[PDB]
């Protein structure tokens, strides 16, 4: 396989899910970040994967190539390039007292993974990515 | 007068203005923040004022009441209330190596004042406010 594991940790996240109105719980979630070669183009992809032992259906992922990352960087004001992005995010996740929100779709077809680094004035959202059900 | 001066400093800002395409210059700008009583409702208003000695037409301001601040906080993920907001922004401006962008309208009818606090991953926008020509 071309898959290289970059990060694999159990983290605490806030899980928001509808009942229309949201119910909120802190939950341990396993986050995996890896790099891999796209089988059709051969280009480098980053893969984000989330799971949790509470629910076998709670299995979501998304792959990010350089082009999709450029959209993400534009949308979220990221100042690092695609090459530096996993390194800086992993350094943040292991160094900083960050906050994760996962907003679960009613039918568990997807979730929004949101990473924050709070400041005294604001939520400090770093980025968000839509993860699809596996 | 009901006006109470809260902040009055000359700061370095990046000024972006059209030629369609933007030309960019660093410029010293005078920023004033004050609180005042609205003459019609009697409610507390924050007033933001920018000027610079390069251009007599470069004179912009906007007033923020509690209701308008709630929209601003929602739009920019601010976690402080209206009462704490000038205090925390002034503490930031005097303590942190912040970055200001001013995006000037072609006819100088308004500008967007944008405050940032860069991180290793992102621009770290705190908020932006539209200031109108005085």
Curated annotation (Swiss-Prot), chains A, B:
**GO CC term (a single one):** centriole
Instruction: Please state the protein's primary subcellular location.
Output: cytoplasm
One annotated GO molecular function:
protein domain specific binding
Q: Which residues form the signal peptide?
A: none
- Keywords, comma-separated and alphabetical: Cell cycle, Coiled coil, Cytoplasm, Cytoskeleton, Developmental protein
Biological processes annotated in GO: centriole assembly; centriole replication; centrosome duplication; protein localization; regulation of cell cycle
Location comes to: Cytoplasm; Cytoplasm, Cytoskeleton, Microtubule organizing center, Centrosome, Centriole
- PISA domain residues: 41-93
Superkingdom of the source species: Eukaryota
Gene disruption phenotype: RNAi-mediated knockdown results in failed centrosome duplication in embryos.
Q: What does this protein do?
A: Central scaffolding component of the centrioles ensuring their 9-fold symmetry. Required for centrosome biogenesis and duplication.
Subunit structure comment from the entry = Nine homodimers form a cartwheel structure with an internal diameter of 23 nM and radial spokes connecting to the microtubule triplets. Interacts with sas-5.
Q: What domain comment accompanies this record?
A: The coiled coil domain is necessary and sufficient for interaction with sas-5. The 35 nM long coiled-coil domain mediates homodimerization while the globular N-terminus links the dimers at an angle of 40 degrees to form the inner ring.
Name the UniProt record assigns to this protein: Spindle assembly abnormal protein 6
The gene is sas-6
């Amino acid at each position: 396989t071309s898959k290289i594991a970059l990060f694999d940790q159990t983290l605490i996240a806030s899980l928001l899910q509808p009942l229309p109105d949201f119910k909120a719980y802190k939950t341990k979630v396993k986050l995996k970040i890896s790099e891999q070669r796209n089988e059709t183009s051969g280009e480098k992809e980053l893969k984000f994967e989330i799971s949790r032992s509470d629910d076998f259906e709670f299995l979501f992922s998304e792959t990010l190539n350089n082009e999709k990352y450029q959209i993400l960087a534009r949308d979220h004001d990221l100042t690092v390039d695609f090459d530096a992005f996993p390194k800086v995010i992993i350094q943040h996740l292991l160094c900083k007292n960050t906050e994760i929100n996962i907003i679960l779709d009613a039918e568990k077809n997807f979730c929004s993974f949101e990473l924050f680094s709070k400041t005294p004035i604001s939520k400090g959202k770093i980025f968000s990515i839509k993860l699809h059900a596996v």
